[PDB]
């Protein structure tokens, strides 16, 4: 369903955020490495740190759009039977009469 | 300046309000009628103090209609400008005739002729300003004014100010 | 005038501290957001106090503090020594010694020269980091009239 | 100046004029849709309502009795004897 | 416009309203035309 | 319905008596310094400097929010925002007069804390000047005793030139560095 | 035990309290010397009573700042300490990342079983969801 | 009412990014201990 | 600035009094042999009149900034040119008091406060459990 798609998108956004956090950690530790005079991680430090910002930016673009879609869907896809019981019993009854 | 004054208002209640939320309606009717008003006699009645200890007193019932009239005593912070008073404030408007300085609840107008000699209105400036060599006065700057006189218009008090003398002007 | 500001900051900090203790003394403890809020207030205060200390630290390094003739030196000397105690928290200085030993590498000997080269490496690394920050930051973007209808149904006029 | 309750010396009984004015005033207020302090046992005339309120001494009014000097004694309708 | 004024007094503030029989409003205007001042005050100053 | 005062006056029919107001300390008939309490006792005039006025109003508008939630039962830049919150809760909202007064007071106040204000209050009250002058001295920051005696002409000879400079020194120190 | 941990926390925070307060009082008296003027009012009542007015003194020195500028080791100590703090912070952040990741696993499992949760008829209300069956 | 959510979220994003970069600037650069405390805060 | 020097026995071979307090100032580790007093002493070997003698000589000076007998005195270390100071030592209870700053004591204060702040912060920070729907709850 549509709501399922929305929820899936939101979950994806959550995943993105998590990624951002992880690469924040990476960035911190590897900055610690660079300050100590290890430059070998300069490629990997900046990569993880830049991939973080890229991932965070992507999540921001994805999340803000999702919020806009919710506002546009108000009144459209989003809010602002005993005859069924009877058919069940009749079915049940004819089944008893003719097993 | 900026005084605290002991005042009393007369409100009249129609009998239908003679219920349990009476004192409440009265204090409310006081804050409606008095707070944010302005009179030549007291200045701007800005804010009523001690909302809990507003004295409602007893209400004399008028003898024709059943209504009841109270003398609500209250304390308020007021604002009344005086001639000769020196005030800091902000420029809010600035034309070829002078500029207005918003001071508290009231504006004060500084006519182009109570201004330092070389400080003159230049309209090519954006926005139009007063442009001395060591001063530029425009629509957002802070000024110190001396109130040359007040005009009472029982609804507001307007006044006219000078920045010409020593120790005045921009700050 | 500076000492007045310093005393103000210290007073505020003391207040926030007492408040924290008060919140802790209650069994259930306060709403977490409130505790964090007060914590932030304390943060602002202590930042102001450290910046003010440091700004006056040249002027604070400048003086001598001893008891005046009116001080009850006879009865309590110990409280006077406590008030004048310049010894750090033995734990703060034990983790200062522990941090410093753990702080990489970096052993005395040295000697300076080579230590200034180390500091230089740190500073140029800082510059590189700043540039990187600059570029990385560069990489992102910041029908009808109801009355008339009714009137028709009641009188027939269009 | 206002005479203290413990020093009041006017009649403990309600005057004809007082009673006529209380009944007039309540009836007026009752008629201006003021809250009624009694069970209207089917009553509709505000004077008959007023009479009923005064009959049960459920009238929240006070008589400020002025003395020729300007001073006064305040008396509650609840406390005034209605021998009229 | 809620404007009040008693020019000559320059009083735009200390003003009251009263309910009197028009014949008295008349009588008072008449006594004035005849140079007599029937000043009406809403407070007392004598006591007794 | 015109809001009255705490004192009485003889209606001599001659409305032509009112004088002007200046910095000869000739405030109104209303604002003269020997004035009368609601309880009837004669107390002195209360003029507030800003900071002091900013606190009175703030302290009062909060006492009022309390009472409204009771009956419901049955950094300077940051403060400019919080204040506009308090107003929409406690004031009639149409009160543009008060809204500016708070923006003004909040931006022009020299002393932030009630402690600091009290320190000014203490200091300035040994001088026994008019309550109007001590208010001005608390509102207008001055460096020279001339600056003071120029912006507050009401002084001139009430306080010495050097004793007034002592005070401006202690005021400048008490000044809150926002 | 959690409560015991709370006791520890309270203990530490209380120590902080005492220290900073002490500093403030000392400052207060030292100021009570000249200005003040109202500054001495920040002193505790017992302390205020205990000490007669007019306490301590001060002297003039430059060159304590120059001696401080002469010795540059404190800056190096600062850098190192900062680095250490950065490391601890790194570890902690890694931990947070893991925890939040797993939390996201379970929560989105819940949300997926709830995408599977099927219908729009019934009224759902809320920190947990409840349905009105009746 | 959803616009408020959008505003709060955007403000939150800006705050997060800005605080991250600015904290990254704050360290590298008891003063050091104070700096560490500030880092912890951010 | 962090230390306290005491030679409690030095009182015993003399007794502790004013000129004594000066000399006992000389006995403690806080004293410097680069001062003028040491020179005067050595020259003598080979209390007002002392102050009179310090006016002739040029160098660092240590003078008497109090007498409360037999307990307290300030002894001032000053640089004479007009007299500039340096630092101020107190003598109370047969123990030399270190002249600790101004700035350093404040440093101590800040340090301590900050430290325990950190402790509380971490300890409490471990405690909370976070759910997106539940926010932060304390179990």
XYZ file of N, CA, C and O in Angstrom, chain H:
168
model
N -0.049 22.741 11.127
C 0.581 22.099 12.274
C 1.747 21.220 11.837
O 2.682 20.980 12.604
N 1.681 20.734 10.601
C 2.765 19.945 10.029
C 3.917 20.842 9.591
O 5.081 20.434 9.602
N 3.580 22.068 9.200
C 4.578 23.067 8.836
C 5.512 23.344 10.009
O 6.700 23.609 9.823
N 4.963 23.277 11.218
C 5.751 23.432 12.432
C 6.749 22.288 12.562
O 7.891 22.491 12.972
N 6.310 21.084 12.206
C 7.186 19.919 12.205
C 8.309 20.104 11.191
O 9.466 19.779 11.468
N 7.961 20.630 10.019
C 8.951 20.896 8.977
C 9.995 21.908 9.448
O 11.201 21.715 9.256
N 9.520 22.981 10.072
C 10.396 24.030 10.581
C 11.332 23.487 11.654
O 12.548 23.684 11.589
N 10.754 22.804 12.638
C 11.522 22.221 13.732
C 12.580 21.258 13.206
O 13.724 21.274 13.662
N 12.192 20.434 12.238
C 13.107 19.465 11.637
C 14.256 20.137 10.892
O 15.411 19.732 11.029
N 13.935 21.155 10.099
C 14.959 21.880 9.350
C 15.952 22.551 10.295
O 17.175 22.401 10.149
N 15.411 23.287 11.265
C 16.211 23.928 12.301
C 17.112 22.907 12.988
O 18.278 23.185 13.281
N 16.562 21.719 13.227
C 17.305 20.637 13.863
C 18.459 20.149 12.993
O 19.540 19.854 13.496
N 18.217 20.055 11.689
C 19.242 19.624 10.742
C 20.391 20.621 10.704
O 21.563 20.249 10.868
N 20.043 21.889 10.484
C 21.027 22.965 10.486
C 21.844 22.942 11.772
O 23.077 22.986 11.738
N 21.145 22.861 12.901
C 21.786 22.775 14.210
C 22.763 21.607 14.299
O 23.863 21.750 14.827
N 22.355 20.453 13.778
C 23.168 19.242 13.850
C 24.449 19.362 13.027
O 25.549 19.114 13.532
N 24.302 19.743 11.760
C 25.453 19.911 10.876
C 26.413 20.956 11.431
O 27.613 20.693 11.621
N 25.866 22.141 11.696
C 26.641 23.259 12.219
C 27.385 22.882 13.490
O 28.569 23.175 13.628
N 26.691 22.225 14.415
C 27.306 21.816 15.672
C 28.398 20.780 15.447
O 29.404 20.772 16.153
N 28.197 19.907 14.465
C 29.200 18.898 14.147
C 30.485 19.547 13.642
O 31.573 19.308 14.187
N 30.359 20.375 12.609
C 31.525 21.035 12.027
C 32.223 21.950 13.035
O 33.455 21.959 13.148
N 31.422 22.711 13.773
C 31.943 23.666 14.744
C 32.628 22.970 15.911
O 33.594 23.488 16.461
N 32.116 21.805 16.296
C 32.763 21.007 17.332
C 34.068 20.446 16.790
O 35.057 20.334 17.515
N 34.060 20.094 15.507
C 35.264 19.606 14.843
C 36.330 20.694 14.797
O 37.528 20.405 14.796
N 35.890 21.947 14.755
C 36.819 23.068 14.825
C 37.276 23.342 16.256
O 38.432 23.687 16.483
N 36.365 23.175 17.212
C 36.628 23.482 18.619
C 37.718 22.591 19.211
O 38.472 23.013 20.088
N 37.769 21.348 18.748
C 38.918 20.476 18.963
C 39.214 19.865 17.599
O 38.370 19.137 17.080
N 40.388 20.104 17.003
C 41.626 20.621 17.619
C 41.631 21.884 18.498
O 42.183 21.862 19.598
N 41.036 22.974 18.022
C 41.065 24.226 18.781
C 39.859 25.122 18.513
O 39.984 26.181 17.898
N 43.670 24.750 33.410
C 42.602 23.794 33.141
C 41.785 24.210 31.922
O 40.627 23.819 31.778
N 42.396 25.006 31.048
C 41.735 25.466 29.832
C 41.403 24.297 28.911
O 40.332 24.256 28.299
N 42.328 23.347 28.821
C 42.138 22.159 27.999
C 40.960 21.336 28.497
O 40.166 20.833 27.703
N 40.859 21.199 29.815
C 39.759 20.469 30.431
C 38.427 21.145 30.122
O 37.427 20.478 29.841
N 38.424 22.473 30.174
C 37.240 23.255 29.841
C 36.834 23.017 28.390
O 35.650 22.839 28.082
N 37.828 23.006 27.507
C 37.598 22.730 26.094
C 36.988 21.344 25.905
O 36.070 21.166 25.106
N 37.507 20.371 26.648
C 36.993 19.004 26.604
C 35.534 18.947 27.044
O 34.707 18.263 26.429
N 35.229 19.673 28.117
C 33.864 19.777 28.617
C 32.940 20.353 27.553
O 31.840 19.840 27.332
N 33.396 21.418 26.898
C 32.639 22.048 25.818
C 32.381 21.068 24.672
O 31.280 21.021 24.103
N 33.406 20.286 24.340
C 33.295 19.256 23.310
C 32.208 18.248 23.680
O 31.349 17.907 22.859
N 32.263 17.778 24.924
C 31.249 16.882 25.468
C 29.848 17.469 25.326
O 28.924 16.784 24.889
N 29.710 18.741 25.687
C 28.457 19.475 25.523
C 27.924 19.462 24.086
O 26.784 19.058 23.839
N 28.757 19.905 23.145
C 28.392 19.923 21.728
C 27.986 18.547 21.196
O 26.938 18.400 20.556
